[PDB]
Write a protein that binds this ligand. Structure first.
Ligand SMILES: NC1=N[C@@]2(CO1)c1cc(NC(=O)c3ccc(Cl)cn3)ccc1Oc1cnc(C3=CCCOC3)cc12
Length: 377
């Protein structure tokens, strides 16, 4: 799959996009890769933030579904008009599919001023598609209309970011060691179950339901490791204790202010590793993924008012459950094995580390009562 390696680009804090084409003749657009939503939605009007936008009037293969879609979400909103057209991924498999496209005609806080993407590719399942599950997501259309296998994998490498989206397979040069798989609990978001959490090997010793209240998902469209409120408190308390050779203000831990060091002398050593144990493939079997401060202390570049190496604490509290965003995914090669309802993790060959510690995927471990860790209404 050499042709798909390095097909992702981006900038820090702005996410990862892939090149796509829509319509006939093909119109090229950069599209954010989002495993936490399920609509293919593209800018279709000249918003001033946009480098370009889908011009349906130029496409002979465009078909109008004569239907609108209104999509508020937690941090913004978009609105648009539904249709279908021919879509392809130049640095992806050599195919063209007829897919649903929402032509975005109005938005708020959706497009980012200064970003180089003009649309969003929701890779999750029909259950959370807008307006309803009858609007078949792109990846479903792709697999149904071609012989592309029903899986994809993401290597997100974290000021220009890069990575690979391998569509229909796995590229073994992108990771080291073995893949370890966790079941997709339910096909809506990429929902998984965290069974145990450690800070520097020290169990938080919470009831594991707390870790998945009310869900845990893998999400390339979020920067942070987001944790349920009670788990975040406990995590921060333990992280504070482990790093207490230096002290930092209460605002920092809340992501309300940054912290700065002299260039090339950030004290990585004083920050602990974070380990999430995930439900394994076998009864009573788990594995663990481990990230470094290099993943959860994220450098902020655009601080015009400062001169030093500044960082944001990128673990935060949530009311929507655990979100394994970029802070997790940048540690690993992640295989969204839809065909087998599972997600594979392996150590990423591009993850940022130091000479003393590296991100890790280890198993098998013996963990009982893993089914009780799931939340049910
Ligand atoms: N996963 C996720 N997708 C977001 C929110 O979180 C969404 C995320 C982003 N993400 C980023 O800009 C971004 C920034 C940095 C990094 Cl590392 C990743 N992504 C942008 C627009 C956007 O716009 C969205 C629009 N709609 C949704 C919906 C989710 C559930 C069903 O209804 C729509 C989600 C989203």
């Amino acid at each position: 799959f050499v042709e798909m390696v390095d097909n992702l680009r981006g900038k820090s804090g702005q996410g990862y996009y892939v090149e796509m084409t829509v319509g006939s003749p093909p119109q090229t657009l950069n599209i954010l890769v989002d495993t936490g939503s399920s609509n293919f939605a593209v800018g279709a009007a000249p918003h001033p933030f946009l480098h370009r936008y889908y011009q349906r009037q130029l496409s002979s293969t465009y078909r109008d579904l004569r239907k609108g879609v209104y999509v508020p979400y937690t941090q913004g909103k978009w609105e648009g008009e539904l249709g279908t057209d021919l879509v392809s991924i130049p640095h992806g498999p050599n195919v063209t599919v007829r897919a649903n496209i929402a032509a975005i005609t109005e938005s708020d806080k959706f497009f980012i001023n200064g970003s180089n993407w003009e649309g969003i590719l929701g890779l999750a399942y029909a259950e959370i598609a807008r307006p309803d599950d009858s609007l078949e997501p792109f990846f479903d259309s792709l697999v149904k209309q071609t012989h592309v296998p029903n899986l994809f994998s993401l290597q997100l490498c974290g000021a220009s970011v890069g990575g690979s989206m391998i569509i229909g397979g796995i590229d073994h040069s992108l990771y080291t060691g073995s893949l370890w798989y966790t079941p997709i609990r339910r096909e809506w978001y990429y929902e998984v179950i965290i069974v145990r959490v450690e800070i520097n090997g020290q169990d938080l010793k919470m009831d594991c339901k707390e870790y998945n209240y009310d869900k845990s998902i893998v999400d390339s469209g979020t920067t942070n490791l987001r944790l349920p409120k009670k788990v975040f408190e406990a995590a921060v308390k333990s992280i504070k204790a482990a790093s207490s050779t230096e002290k930092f203000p209460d605002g920092f831990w809340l992501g309300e202010q940054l912290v700065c060091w002299q260039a090339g002398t950030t004290p990585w050593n004083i920050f602990p590793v974070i380990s999430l144990y995930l439900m394994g493939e076998v009864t009573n079997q788990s594995f663990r993924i481990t990230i470094l401060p290099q993943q959860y202390l994220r450098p902020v570049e655009d601080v015009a008012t400062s001169q030093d190496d500044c960082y944001k604490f990128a673990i935060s509290q949530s009311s929507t459950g655990t979100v394994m965003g970029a802070v997790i995914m940048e540690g690993f090669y992640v295989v969204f094995d839809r065909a087998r309802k599972r997600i594979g993790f392996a150590v990423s060959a591009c993850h940022v580390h130091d000479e003393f510690r590296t991100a890790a995927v280890e198993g098998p471990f013996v963990t009982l009562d893993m089914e009780d860790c799931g939340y049910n209404i």
